[PDB]
C-alpha cells in the first residue's frame, strides 16, 4: 500500500535525521544499540534503541524496519547494513521523494 | 473570546507556521484532518458546525512553491484553501518588488481575508505576524501589511516575531538592504517585535540539542515552542495569568523601545533528559544564560530593562520567586537604574507538549524569557555598517530603484536606524 | 480537490475518496457513476485509479 | 507556474539545447515520446515550467530552435529526444551564415527573425506567468552569435521586465576552431552587455579541462561537454521546478549576483563531478561539495578565479541537507579566502537549497560566480580582435553585408569599458 | 579519539606498512573491502585511531603511502589488503631514487613532498585529537630514507608538540643489501636524532636469526619479517585502541623510556614467539613471556643487550594477567641481571598492561629496550661509512644531487656523538 | 546533613572509585541502575525526583579510556554523565603535563561540577580525594585540584587517599619524580593524607588471602573496604561515634605530620573463615601486626604518635578497651613519650558488607587502624634518594621542563621532603 510505503519512507527519514546529527553519531548509536559485546544487532536491541530514541512507533513497524535493514536472512543487523539504510539521504531520501512509485 | 489572528509572510513565515500549527494541533488534540476526537482552541482555531476546526491563520507569499508545499503536505484538510494566498512572481529578495509593484494586490487580498477572519472573532487579543526581515516577500509585503493593519484596525496588538540576519553567517547579499528598509517600516507599526537570529538558534541546537547539523525544521520547532509558551496563558488557565495586552504594559517602557530578546529553557534532547534536576532555579538560570538566547547578542554588553517570564508546567510561585531573587542578587545580570522591579512573572499549569519525531524531550517545567534590554542595539549597529559599506558604492541600488523606490528611501531608513541606535544609547545611559 | 484528499501524494485514490471529491464538486453524483468512470478510465485495477 | 522560454541558436546552441532537454526530460521522467514515465509526484508538480500538455499526456518543451542551415536540426530531430519538440518551433533558413556575424545579424537573420519572433511570442503568450527566456548559443559563430544577439535585442524590446538568461559558449583561449571567432565574439559581447540581464560564460577548453582532470575521461566528444552544460542549465533552475528548503528563482539569483547592471557575466560550475574509480571512495558531504565548487578547476570558465576577486557568488544546493552546514561551510570559505572576495560587500555568497537532488546523485550543487577574473578572458578576446582589426583581415566579408566599420570600433570600446569596470571593482577599496 | 597518522616510505616501508595494515584490519575485524566484520564491540570503540568512516560502513586507513617509483605501490594496491587505502593517499613520482638519499631528500622527493604534506595535513585536520604520526621506512635506501627524513622534518616543523614515532629497518651488520647503505644510514640517523621523538631500530639479519631459531622457519620471505614487525607495531599502540588495566599511550612510553632527548632509539621484540613444534610443549605464562622477552635472541635489533646496559625498558603486556605477576617478574629480572641494568635509575621497567590480547594469543607482550647496546651498531655504521668516505666511493652521486660534502661529515659527527653518549651513560657511575 | 564529596583523579583513582562505589551501593542497597527498592545514603548519595540516587562523586581524568570504561560498564545509569569528566590527551606520567598545560581547562570544569555538587549539600564534612601519587594525572592534576579547593572552599577537610610507589617493585620510571613533586604539593593542601603501597597490598593478598596472583581489582577492593570502614560512622550509628572533622583533632598532632598508615583486619578468605575466634583482641593484634599494614614500612622502626581504630560489627567497649590496654602494655609496639593516650577508638554497629565475587569473607568484626607514626619517614627516605639519584643526572628532567617546570621546582620539592624528614626525626625525638 502507498500508505505503508510512505510510512516506511517517513520513518527511515526520521531515524536518519535523528542520527547523523553529528559526525560518527551513527557509529555511537550503533554501539549503544547492543548491550552485548557483539556488533550484530538483535531484534530486541533494535526495539530498545528505537525506544531510546524519542519516537512513538509500533512494534510492527519496528519489525518492518528490522527486516528492511538487510539481515542477510540471518536475523541480526550488521554495522554495514545499519549504515546502508541509515545513511544521510540515499535510500531514505529516495523513498521519501518517490511517492508515485 | 481570546482569539489571536496568525499571519505568516514569506518563506520563513510559512515554514515557522508549519511547525507552529503542528504544535498547536498536537497541543489541542486537533488531528491533521481538521477535527478532534473546552474552547481552549478558540485562540487559534474556529470550530464549524460539522466539528471541523480551521486555524485563524493566513499564509501570505509571493512565491507559489512554499504555499503549495502546505497544500501538498500533511496539513491539507486543516487550513482554509483561500486562507493560503499565493503570488505568481517571487519578490526576488527585493524590498521594492515586495512593497511597491508585486505586493499591492496580494496585500489587498490579504487585508480582505484578514477582515473576514477578524469578523469571526468575538474578542481579538491581536495579531501574530511571522515574517523574514531580509527578504522581499517577508520584508516588503510584511511591512505593507503591517502598515495597512495599523491604518485600519488601529490599536490591536501586533506582535512581530521577526527573523533578522545573523551577524557573520547569512544566506543573502542584499539582506542588509531589505533588513534596514523593513526595520524602518516596523519601528513605527508593530507593538512588540520579538527578535530572532538563525545563528543563535543554530548555536542553541548545537550546544543544547547536540545537533551539529541543524536544519530549518529544527529552528522552526524551537520557535514554535517559544510562541506556544508565550500564548499558553491565553488558552490554559494558570496562576499569574499573563495577557497579550499585559506583555506591552509590563515590557514596553517607551513606544520606540519594543524589541524583545527571547530565550527558551530547557532545551534537552531525549538522551540527555531526566539526568539533571531541571528545577525551577536551574531552568531560570539556563534561560538567563547568554548561550541560550535566541539572538546573537550578548546581554552582558547591555542592561536588562524588563524581563517577562512564562513558566509552564509544575512551577510553584515560591520557587519562581526564589529563582528570580537569585537572578536579581546575581552580579552578572544588570538592570537599568530606573526599573527596580523589572520582572513580570507568569505561571501556567499546562506543561509544554512535545512534538513526536522532534528532538525536544518531555519536560514538566519550561521557561520562556522575553526581555527588553539595551543590548539589542548591538545587532542594529552591525546591520548599520553592513548597510553603509554597501551603500557607499550603491551596490544593488538599481535593483531597488527599478521597482519604484528612491535613494531617499535608503537614506531615511539609515537615518531612522541611527535614531533608534541613539534612543537605545539614551535609555541605557543614566 | 483530489490532491487535497490524497494524503500519500501517490496520485491514486480509493473509491470512497474519489466519490467524496466528486460530491464536493457536484453534490448529486452517486458512487456508482464514479465507480463506472473509474472502470472506464482504468479497466484492470484493484482500485486506486490515477485522478 | 513561472514559465521559461528556452531558445537554441546555431549548431553549438542547438546541440547544447538538445542535450539539456534530454537531461530535463530524464529528470522529470519524460520518455522520448513525451508520456510521463517517472513515478514521482514532484516531477509532474512543476513540469509546466518547461513543458506544455498536448491533446494526450504528451509533454513538449517550450523550446525554439533557431538556425540558418537545416542539417543541424535534421540531426537534432534524429537525436534521442528529437521528436519531443514541437515541429512548429523549428525555425531554420536555407543558407547558413559562413561563421559571419554580419550575415547572421543583418542580411540573412533579418528575414527569419520575423518568424522567430512570431514563434517566441506565441510561446510566451501561452504562458500563465513568464519568468523569462534562456538562450543557449555560442559566441564565435555566424548564425549562433548573430541570430542570438538579434533575438535577444528583440525580446528585450518586447519584454523588458522579463528575465533574460544566456548560456554563451565563448571561443576558447588557446585552441580556436574558426578564424573569425574574435570578430563574432567582440560583436556579440557588445550586444550581450546591453541586452542580456544574466549571462553564463562557457569555454570548450575549460570543459575539456574539467573532463580530463575531474572526470578523467579519455576521448570525450562534444556530447560530454554538452552534458555538463546541460547539468549546469538544469541546476540553475531546479529551484523553480522542485520544492526547496530555501528556494531562489532566477530573478533572486540575478538580484543577489549583479551589483551593477553591466557586471552580469558569471562563471559556473557543477558538483560533484568525479571519476569512475574514486566514486566509491569520495565522501558525499556538504564540505566536500563546497571544496570542489570553490576550486578553480571545477569552473567551466577558462579564467581562473585566483587572479580576480569574487564580486558575488551564488550556490544552489540540491538534496536533503543541513542549512546550518551549508551556511557554515560557505562562511568558512569566505573567511579563509577573504583575499579573493570583495571587501565592500559583507557577504558575497547567496545560498539556495532545494530538496530534490538530480537523478542518480545523492547530492548536488551548482555554482554561479561573478568575479573580476573574466576580465582576463575579455582582455584576450580584445587582444585577438585588435590584432586582426589593425590589418582589417577578413573585414571585407562583414563590410559586404552592410555593416559599418564603426560598429567594430564601438563594440571594442564597449568591451574595453566592461574590462575597465571589472578592474575598477577588483581594486576598489572600502571607504 | 587520539588519532595516529600512518606513513609509509620506500619499498621496504610500503611493504611493512601493507603487512601492518593487514594485521590491524584483522585485529579490528575489517575485511579487505572495508566493512567491519568483527562481531565485537571493543574493536569498533576506538577504530578511529587508525581508520576513518567512509560513506558506507567502509573504513579507510589513515595511511599515506609515498614513493618515487610506481611498481612498489602497484604491488601494494594489488595485494590482499590494497583496496582499503584511499588512492589519493598514494603520492609517488615517476623516476625512483636510485637508492640515493640525496635524490630522495633533495632532488626528486622535494617536488613530491608538497603533495605529501598536503595529504598529511588533510588527514590530520580531520582528526579530533592527534596523538601523532608513525612513519615506517628503512635506513639504507634512497627514496625510503630520504623522503622519510624530509617528511619527518616537515611534520616536526608543522606540529612540534605532536608525537613522532619511526620504525626504521637499519641495515644489517654481516650482509649488506645495498652498497650505499652506510651513507644512507648515516644521513638518515642524523635526521632521526634531531627530529623523530621515538625511533625503533630493526635489522633484517636479526629477524632472520630470530625466525630461524625461535620460530624455526625454513624459508622466511620478507612477508614473515614484515609480519613480525607489524606485530610489534600493533602492540606498541594497542593501549590506545583497547582498554587496559594499566594503560600507557605513546607519550607515556616516551616519557618513561627516554631519559635524555637524543637517546630515543630503542630495540624491540615480540613475545611469545614459538616454533610450531613446541607450541604444545611451552607454557603460556607471564614468567615464560618475561624470560623469552629478556633473551638476547628475541631482540629484533642486531646489537645484543649483553654488551650494553639497559637504560630503560618498557614491556606492554596484553591479556588477562596479574599485575602482581608482571611487576614481580620484571623486578626479579632487574635484580637478577643488575649488571645489565643502569645503576643510577632505581627502576628500569615501564610495565603496561592491556586487557585485550592479539587474536590467537591468550597473552602477549611487546618489549621496547633503551640500552647502550645500540652503541655497537652505530659504531659499525661508523666503520663502514668512514671506510667508504676515505676514498669518496659512490659519493659523487650525492654530490651531483646538490648536497655538500659537509652534510655527510655533519651526519657522521652527530652519529658518533650519539655513540659516545651511549658509552658515557653505560659507564656512568652513581655519585 | 553529613555529605562528603568524593573525587577520583587518574586511572588508579577511578579504578579504586569503582570498587568504593560498588561497595557503597551494596551497603546501602542501591541497585546499579541508580535507585533502591533512614536517609543513610545522604553522606554519599542524593536522591532525585524519580527516586534515583546519584553519588556525590566526580570522576576526573585526562584520558578518555578509563572514564569510558565506566560510561559503558554496569555503573552507567548511576553516575551523572557530566560527573564523568574526560580529557583528550593523557598526562603521560608527567606532573608538568598534568599540572601546568593540559590540566587547566579540565580542572576548571572540575571546579564547576564540584561547585554544583556542593550546592546540593546542606552540610559538607569535606572532600575525599582518591588519586595515584606517581603519575601525571594522579599527581599533577590532583595537586592542582587540591590547590584550587583549598583556595576557594576553605575550611572543608580534605582527606587524600594517596597511592605511593612501592619500595622496590614499580611500574613507572619517573615515579619518584612525580611522587616527590606531588608530596610537596599535598604536604600543605591535604588535611589527612593516607599512604597506600601496592607492594604491601600484594603481600597482604599473598599471605592473608592466599592469592598468588593478586591484581588491581583485588587491591582496589581492599582499599574500598578500608575507606568504607573509615566512613561507616558517618552513615551508621554506633557506640563511640567518630567524625570526619575529629579525625584531625584525634589524629594529627602537628599539621605537617598528617600522613597515615592504614591496616585492615581481618583479611581472610571464606575457606579460612569460621576457623579461628576472630575476637576483638586478636583482630586488634593483627591490625597492629607489621604484615597487615598497607604500606611497606616496618612500624617497629619508628614510634606511633596516634592510632585511630574503627571497629565494625559486634564490638563492645570492654573488648576494645582490653585490646588497646594489651597493645599498650605490649613491649614491641612503642608510642611516643608526649602522647600518653594516643588512641581514638570508635565502634559501629554495621558489620562490613562483602562484595559478591570478592575474596574477603563475611566477618562479624572488622578493624580499620589508621595510625600517625614517625616510622613513615622511612618510605620518604626511600623516595628521597630514588629522586636524588636520578636528579643528579637530571634524568627525564627535560620532559618535565618542556611543559613549564623548572629545576628550582624539583629542588624545592626535594628540599621540602628533606624538611619533612627532619620534622619526623624531631617529632619522634623527645
Ligand atoms: N528561522 C528561519 N528562517 C528562515 C527559514 N526559511 C527562510 N528563512 C530566512 O528567510 C529569509 C528569506 O525569506 P523570504 O523573503 O520569505 O524568501 P522568499 O519566500 O523566497 O521571498 P523573497 O526571498 O523575498 O523573494 C532568508 O534570509 C532566511 O534567513 C526558516 O525555516 N527558519
Ligand atoms: N592500587 C592500585 N594502583 C593503581 C591502579 N591503577 C593504576 N595504579 C597506579 O597508578 C599509577 C599511574 O596512574 P595514573 O597517573 O592515573 O595513570 P594515567 O591514568 O594513565 O594518567 P597518567 O599516567 O598520569 O598520564 C601507576 O603507577 C599504578 O601503580 C589500581 O587499580 N590499583
Ligand atoms: N560544447 C559544444 N561546443 C560546440 C558544439 N558544436 C560547436 N561547438 C563550438 O561552438 C563554436 C561556434 O560554432 P557555432 O556557432 O555553433 O557555428 P554556427 O552555428 O554555424 O554559427 C565552434 O567553434 C565550436 O568549437 C557542441 O556540440 N558542443
Ligand atoms: N623487512 C623487510 N625489509 C625490506 C623489504 N624490502 C626491502 N627491505 C629492506 O629495506 C632496505 C632498503 O630498501 P628500500 O629503502 O626500500 O629501497 P628504496 O625503496 O629504493 O629506498 C633493504 O636493505 C632491504 O633489505 C621487505 O619487504 N621487508
Q: E268, E272, E364: which is closest to E321 by C-alpha?
A: E364
Distance (Å) from the C-alpha of residue B279 to the closest C-alpha of chain F?
Answer: 10
d(CA B5, CA F185): 68
Q: B53, B86, B54, B57: which is closest to B69 by C-alpha?
A: B86
Is there a contact between E363 and E321 (Cβ–Cβ < 8 Å)?
Answer: yes
Chains D and F lie in contact, requiring 3 or more CB pairs less than 8 Å apart: no
Is there a contact between D228 and D270 (Cβ–Cβ < 8 Å)?
Answer: yes
What secondary structure letter does DSSP report for D28? T
Distance (Å) from the C-alpha of residue B67 to the closest C-alpha of chain C?
Answer: 13
Instruction: Please name the residues in contact with B397: beta carbons below 8 A apart, sequence gap of 6 or more.
Output: B391, B407, B410
Contact F49 B272 (CB under 8 A): no
d(CA B253, CA B428): 12
The x, y and z cell numbers of residue E407, run together, are 652534510
d(CA B395, CA B400): 10
List all residues of chain F from 14 to 53 with a beta carbon under 8 Å from chain E.
none
Residue D301: half-sphere exposure toward Cβ, Cα within 13 Å:
31
d(CA B103, CA B140): 8
The x, y and z cell numbers of residue F183, run together, are 608530596
∠ CA E290-E291-E292 to the nearest 5 degrees?
A: 90
User: B94 vs B176, B402, D130, D236, CA distance in Å?
Assistant: 11, 10, 18, 19
d(CA D173, CA D77): 32
Read off φ and ψ for residue B354, nearest 5 degrees: -105, 135
CA D406 / ligand 3 centre spacing (Å): 27
* Chain F nearest-CA residue for E312: F173
For chain E, what is the radius of gyration of the CA atoms?
A: 21
Is there a contact between E410 and E344 (Cβ–Cβ < 8 Å)?
Answer: no
**CA B140 to ligand 1: nearest atom:** 24
For chain F, what is the radius of gyration of the CA atoms?
A: 21
Establish if D284 touches chain E: CB-CB under 8 angstroms. Answer: yes
d(CA F157, CA F261): 18
Is there a contact between D368 and D200 (Cβ–Cβ < 8 Å)?
Answer: yes
Contact D283 E87 (CB under 8 A): no
d(CA E186, CA E146): 11
* Chain B nearest-CA residue for A29: B271
Partners of residue C42 in chain D, C-beta under 8 Å:
none
What does the buried/exposed string (b/e) look like for B157-168 if buried means 16 or more CB atoms within 10 Å of the residue's CB? bbbbbbbbbbbe
CA E138 / ligand 4 centre spacing (Å): 6
d(CA E373, CA E267): 9
Is there a contact between D286 and D272 (Cβ–Cβ < 8 Å)?
Answer: no
Partners of residue E87 in chain D, C-beta under 8 Å:
277-278, 281
Read off φ and ψ for residue B321, nearest 5 degrees: -65, -45
d(CA E173, CA B98): 85
Q: D388, D232, D237: which is closest to D298 by C-alpha?
A: D232
Read off φ and ψ for residue D3, nearest 5 degrees: -80, 155
Chains A and C lie in contact, requiring 3 or more CB pairs less than 8 Å apart: yes
Contact D283 E86 (CB under 8 A): no
Place of cell 509572510: B9
Contact C8 A2 (CB under 8 A): yes
Distance (Å) from the C-alpha of residue D41 to the closest C-alpha of chain C?
Answer: 7
User: A54 vs A15, B60, B156, B356, F72, CA distance in Å?
Assistant: 10, 34, 40, 7, 21
Is F63 labelled as part of a ligand binding site? yes
Of all helices (H) and strands (E), which one includes residue D103? none
CA B379 / ligand 1 centre spacing (Å): 19
Q: D367, D304, D313: which is closest to D342 by C-alpha?
A: D313
Place of cell 515557522: B16
Count of C-D CB contacts under 8 Å: 3
> Which residue intervals of D79-221 are DSSP H helices?
101-102, 108-126, 142-158, 181-195, 204-213
Is there a contact between D349 and D314 (Cβ–Cβ < 8 Å)?
Answer: yes
d(CA E236, CA E27): 14
The x, y and z cell numbers of residue F366, run together, are 572488622
Partners of residue D38 in chain A, C-beta under 8 Å:
100
CA F132 / ligand 2 centre spacing (Å): 6
Q: Cβ < 6 Å from ligand 4: which residues?
A: E 10-12, 15-16, 99, 138, 140-144, 169, 171, 177-178, 204, 222, 225-226
d(CA B36, CA B44): 14
Q: Cβ < 6 Å from ligand 3: which residues?
A: D 10-12, 15-16, 96, 138, 140-144, 169, 177-178, 204, 222, 225-226
**CA B90 to ligand 1: nearest atom:** 25
∠ CA D409-D413-D417 to the nearest 5 degrees?
A: 170
Distance (Å) from the C-alpha of residue E54 to the closest C-alpha of chain D?
Answer: 6
Count of A-B CB contacts under 8 Å: 27
User: F346 vs B131, F243, F250, CA distance in Å?
Assistant: 73, 9, 11
Nearest ligand for residue E168 CA: 4
User: F355 vs F42, F208, F217, CA distance in Å?
Assistant: 21, 17, 12
Q: Is B264 helix (H, G, I), strand (E, B) or coil?
A: strand
What does the buried/exposed string (b/e) look like for D304-319 if buried means 16 or more CB atoms within 10 Å of the residue's CB? bbeebbbbbbbbbbbb
The long-range contacts involving B152-158, CB below 8 angstroms and separated by at least 24 positions, are B152/B111, B153/B118, B153/B127, B156/B124, B156/B126, B156/B127, B157/B125, B157/B126, B157/B127, B157/B191, B157/B192, B157/B244, B157/B245, B157/B247, B157/B248, B158/B126, B158/B127, B158/B129, B158/B189, B158/B190, B158/B191
d(CA B150, CA B129): 13
List all residues of chain F from 337 to 396 with a beta carbon under 8 Å from chain E.
386, 389-390, 392-393, 395-396
Is there a contact between E28 and E39 (Cβ–Cβ < 8 Å)?
Answer: no
d(CA E40, CA A60): 29
d(CA F378, CA F169): 16
Instruction: Please name the residues in contact with C45: beta carbons below 8 A apart, sequence gap of 6 or more.
Output: C38
Give the torsion sign (CA, D410, D416, D420, D421).
positive
Chains D and A lie in contact, requiring 3 or more CB pairs less than 8 Å apart: yes
User: F87 vs E241, E390, F419, CA distance in Å?
Assistant: 16, 55, 35
List all residues of chain B from 54 to 73 with a beta carbon under 8 Å from chain C.
71-72
Instruction: Please name the residues in contact with F426: beta carbons below 8 A apart, sequence gap of 6 or more.
Output: none
Contact A100 D319 (CB under 8 A): no
Instruction: Please name the residues in contact with B387: beta carbons below 8 A apart, sequence gap of 6 or more.
Output: B176, B177, B179, B180, B414, B417
User: D12 vs B111, B403, D66, D135, CA distance in Å?
Assistant: 51, 36, 11, 12
Separation of CA B251 from chain center:
15
Distance (Å) from the C-alpha of residue B50 to the closest C-alpha of chain C?
Answer: 15
d(CA E208, CA D273): 50
Q: Is C13 helix (H, G, I), strand (E, B) or coil?
A: strand
F246 carries an active-site annotation: yes
- Print the SS3 string covering chain F: CCCEEEEEEHHHHHHHHHHHHHHHHHHHCCCCCCCCCCCCCCCCEEECCCCCEEECEEEEECCHHHHHHHHHCHHHCCCCCCCEEECCCCCCCCHHHHHHHCHHHHHHHHHHHHHHHHCCCCCCCEEEEEEECCCHHHHHHHHHHHHHHHHHCCCCEEEEEEEECCCCCCCCCCHHHHHHHHHHHHCCCCCEEEEEEHHHHHHHHHHCCCCCCCCHHHHHHHHHHHHHHHHHHHHCCCCCCCCHHHHHHHHCCECCECEEEEEEECCCCCCCCCCCCCCHHHHHHHHCCCCCECCCCCCCCCCEEEEEEEEEECCCHHHHHHHHHHHHHCCCCCECCCCCCCEEEEEECCCCCCCCCCCCCCCCEEEEEEEEEHHHHHHHHHHHHHHHHHHHHCCCHHHHHHCCCCHHHHHHHHHHHHHHHHHHHHHHCC
d(CA F73, CA F54): 16
Ligand 3, pocket-test mutation among D9, D12, D142, most atoms within 8 A of CB: D12
Read off φ and ψ for residue B7, nearest 5 degrees: -120, 130
Partners of residue E162 in chain F, C-beta under 8 Å:
none
> Which residue intervals of D66-159 are DSSP H helices?
71-78, 101-102, 108-126, 142-158
Of all helices (H) and strands (E), which one includes residue E419? helix E405-426
Calculate the CA dihedral of residues E109, E112, E113, E115 and round it to 10 degrees: -170
> Which residue intervals of E345-404 are DSSP H helices?
374-391, 395-400
d(CA B340, CA B328): 10
Is E226 labelled as part of a ligand binding site? yes
**Exposure of B35 by Cβ count < 10 A (0-12 exposed, 13-18 middle, 19+ buried)?**
middle
Amino acid at each position: 500500500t502507498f500508505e505503508q510505503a510512505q510510512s516506511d519512507a517517513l520513518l527511515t527519514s526520521l531515524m536518519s535525521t535523528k542520527l547523523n546529527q553529528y559526525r560518527d553519531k551513527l557509529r555511537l548509536i550503533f554501539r549503544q544499540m547492543d548491550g552485548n559485546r557483539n556488533s550484530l544487532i538483535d531484534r530486541e536491541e533494535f526495539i530498545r534503541g528505537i525506544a531510546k530514541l524519542r519516537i512513538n512507533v509500533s512494534k510492527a513497524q519496528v519489525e518492518r524496519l528490522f527486516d528492511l535493514c538487510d539481515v542477510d536472512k540471518s536475523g541480526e543487523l550488521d554495522y554495514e547494513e545499519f549504515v546502508n539504510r541509515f545513511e544521510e539521504n540515499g535510500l531514505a531520501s529516495a523513498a521519501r521523494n518517490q511517492t508515485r512509485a | 473570546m481570546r482569539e489571536v489572528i496568525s499571519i505568516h509572510i514569506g518563506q520563513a513565515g510559512i515554514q515557522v507556521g508549519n511547525a507552529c500549527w503542528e504544535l498547536y494541533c498536537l497541543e489541542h488534540g486537533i488531528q491533521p484532518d481538521g477535527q478532534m476526537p473546552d474552547d481552549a482552541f478558540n485562540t487559534f482555531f474556529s470550530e464549524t458546525g460539522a466539528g471541523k476546526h480551521v486555524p485563524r491563520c493566513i499564509f501570505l507569499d509571493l512565491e507559489p512553491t512554499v504555499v503549495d508545499e502546505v497544500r501538498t503536505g500533511t496539513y491539507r484538510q486543516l487550513f482554509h484553501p483561500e486562507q493560503l494566498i499565493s503570488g505568481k512572481e517571487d519578490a526576488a529578495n527585493n524590498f521594492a518588488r515586495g512593497h511597491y509593484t508585486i505586493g499591492k494586490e496580494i496585500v489587498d487580498l490579504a487585508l480582505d481575508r484578514i477582515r473576514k477572519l477578524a469578523d469571526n472573532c468575538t474578542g481579538l487579543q491581536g495579531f501574530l505576524v511571522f515574517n523574514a526581515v531580509g527578504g522581499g516577500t517577508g520584508s516588503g509585503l510584511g511591512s505593507l501589511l503591517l502598515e495597512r493593519l495599523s491604518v485600519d484596525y488601529g490599536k490591536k496588538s501586533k506582535l512581530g516575531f521577526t527573523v533578522y540576519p545573523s551577524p557573520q553567517v547569512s544566506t543573502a547579499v542584499v539582506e542588509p538592504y531589505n533588513s534596514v528598509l523593513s526595520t524602518h517600516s516596523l519601528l513605527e507599526h508593530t507593538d512588540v517585535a520579538v527578535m530572532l537570529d538563525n545563528e543563535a538558534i543554530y548555536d542553541i541546537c548545537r550546544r543544547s540539542l547536540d545537533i551539529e547539523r541543524p536544519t530549518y525544521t529544527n529552528l522552526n520547532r524551537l520557535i514554535a515552542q517559544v510562541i506556544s509558551s508565550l500564548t499558553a496563558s491565553l488558552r490554559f488557565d494558570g496562576a499569574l495569568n499573563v495577557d497579550i495586552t499585559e506583555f506591552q504594559t509590563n515590557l514596553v517602557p517607551y513606544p520606540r523601545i519594543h524589541f524583545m530578546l527571547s530565550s527558551y529553557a530547557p532545551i534537552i534532547s531525549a538522551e540527555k533528559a531526566y539526568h539533571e534536576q531541571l528545577s525551577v532555579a536551574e531552568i531560570t538560570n539556563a534561560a538567563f544564560e547568554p548561550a541560550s538566547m535566541m539572538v546573537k547578542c550578548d546581554p552582558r554588553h547591555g542592561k536588562y530593562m524588563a524581563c517577562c517570564l512564562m513558566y509552564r508546567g509544575d512551577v510553584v510561585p515560591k520557587d519562581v520567586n526564589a529563582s528570580v531573587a537569585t537572578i536579581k542578587t546575581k552580579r552578572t545580570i544588570q538592570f537599568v537604574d530606573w526599573c527596580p522591579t523589572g520582572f513580570k512573572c507568569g505561571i501556567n499549569y499546562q506543561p509544554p507538549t512535545v512534538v513526536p519525531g522532534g528532538d525536544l524531550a518531555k519536560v514538566q517545567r519550561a521557561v520562556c524569557m522575553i526581555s527588553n534590554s539595551t543590548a539589542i542595539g548591538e545587532i542594529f549597529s552591525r546591520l548599520d555598517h553592513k548597510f553603509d559599506l554597501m551603500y557607499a558604492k550603491r551596490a544593488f541600488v538599481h535593483w531597488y530603484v527599478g521597482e519604484g523606490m528612491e535613494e531617499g528611501e535608503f537614506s531615511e531608513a539609515r537615518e531612522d536606524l541611527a535614531a533608534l541606535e541613539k534612543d537605545f544609547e539614551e535609555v541605557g545611559a543614566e | 480537490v483530489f490532491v487535497r484528499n490524497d494524503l500519500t501524494r501517490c496520485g491514486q485514490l480509493p473509491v470512497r475518496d474519489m466519490t467524496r471529491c466528486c460530491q464536493a464538486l457536484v453534490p448529486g453524483i452517486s458512487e456508482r457513476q464514479v465507480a463506472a468512470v473509474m472502470a472506464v478510465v482504468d479497466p484492470n485495477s484493484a482500485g486506486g485509479v490515477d485522478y | 507556474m513561472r514559465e521559461i522560454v528556452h531558445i537554441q541558436g546555431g549548431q553549438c546552441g542547438n546541440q547544447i539545447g538538445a542535450k539539456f532537454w534530454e537531461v530535463v526530460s530524464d529528470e522529470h521522467g519524460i520518455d522520448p515520446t513525451g508520456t510521463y514515465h517517472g513515478d514521482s509526484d514532484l516531477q509532474l508538480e512543476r513540469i509546466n515550467v518547461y513543458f506544455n500538455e498536448a491533446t494526450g499526456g504528451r509533454y513538449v518543451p517550450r523550446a525554439i530552435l533557431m538556425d540558418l542551415e537545416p542539417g543541424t536540426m535534421d540531426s537534432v530531430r534524429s537525436g534521442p529526444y528529437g521528436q519531443i519538440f514541437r515541429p512548429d518551433n523549428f525555425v531554420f533558413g536555407q543558407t547558413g551564415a559562413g561563421n559571419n556575424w554580419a550575415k547572421g545579424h543583418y542580411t540573412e537573420g533579418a528575414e527569419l527573425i520575423d518568424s522567430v519572433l512570431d514563434v517566441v511570442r506565441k510561446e510566451a503568450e501561452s504562458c500563465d506567468c513568464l519568468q523569462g527566456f534562456q538562450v543557449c548559443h555560442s559566441l564565435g559563430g555566424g548564425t549562433g552569435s548573430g541570430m542570438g544577439t538579434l533575438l535577444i535585442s528583440k525580446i528585450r524590446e518586447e519584454y523588458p521586465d522579463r528575465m533574460m538568461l544566456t548560456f554563451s559558449v565563448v571561443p576558447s583561449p588557446k585552441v580556436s576552431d574558426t578564424v573569425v571567432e574574435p570578430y563574432n565574439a567582440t560583436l556579440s559581447v557588445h550586444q550581450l552587455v546591453e541586452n542580456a540581464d544574466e549571462c553564463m560564460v562557457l569555454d570548450n577548453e575549460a570543459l575539456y579541462d574539467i573532463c580530463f582532470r575531474t572526470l578523467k575521461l579519455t576521448t570525450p566528444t562534444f556530447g560530454d561537454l554538452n552534458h555538463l552544460i546541460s547539468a549546469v542549465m538544469s541546476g540553475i533552475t531546479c529551484c523553480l521546478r522542485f520544492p526547496g528548503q530555501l528556494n531562489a528563482d532566477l530573478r533572486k539569483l540575478a538580484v543577489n549576483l549583479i551589483p551593477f547592471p553591466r557586471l552580469h557575466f558569471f562563471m559556473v560550475g557543477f558538483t560533484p563531478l568525479t571519476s569512475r574509480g574514486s566514486q566509491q571512495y569520495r565522501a558525499l558531504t556538504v564540505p566536500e561539495l563546497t571544496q570542489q565548487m570553490w576550486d578553480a578547476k571545477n569552473m567551466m570558465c577558462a579564467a581562473d578565479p585566483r587572479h580576480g576577486r569574487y564580486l558575488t557568488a551564488s550556490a544552489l544546493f540540491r538534496g536533503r541537507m543541513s542549512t546550518k552546514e551549508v551556511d557554515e561551510q560557505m562562511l568558512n570559505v569566505q573567511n579563509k579566502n577573504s583575499s579573493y572576495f570583495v571587501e565592500w560587500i559583507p557577504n558575497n555568497v547567496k545560498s539556495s537549497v532545494c530538496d530534490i537532488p538530480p537523478k542518480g546523485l545523492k547530492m548536488s550543487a551548482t555554482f554561479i560566480g561573478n568575479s573580476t577574473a573574466i576580465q582576463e578572458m575579455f582582455k584576450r578576446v580584445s587582444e585577438q580582435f585588435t590584432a586582426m582589426f589593425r590589418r582589417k583581415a577578413f573585414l571585407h566579408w562583414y563590410t559586404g553585408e552592410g555593416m559599418d566599420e564603426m560598429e567594430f570600433t564601438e563594440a571594442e570600446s564597449n568591451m574595453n569599458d566592461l574590462v575597465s569596470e571589472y578592474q575598477q571593482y577588483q581594486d576598489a577599496s572600502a571607504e
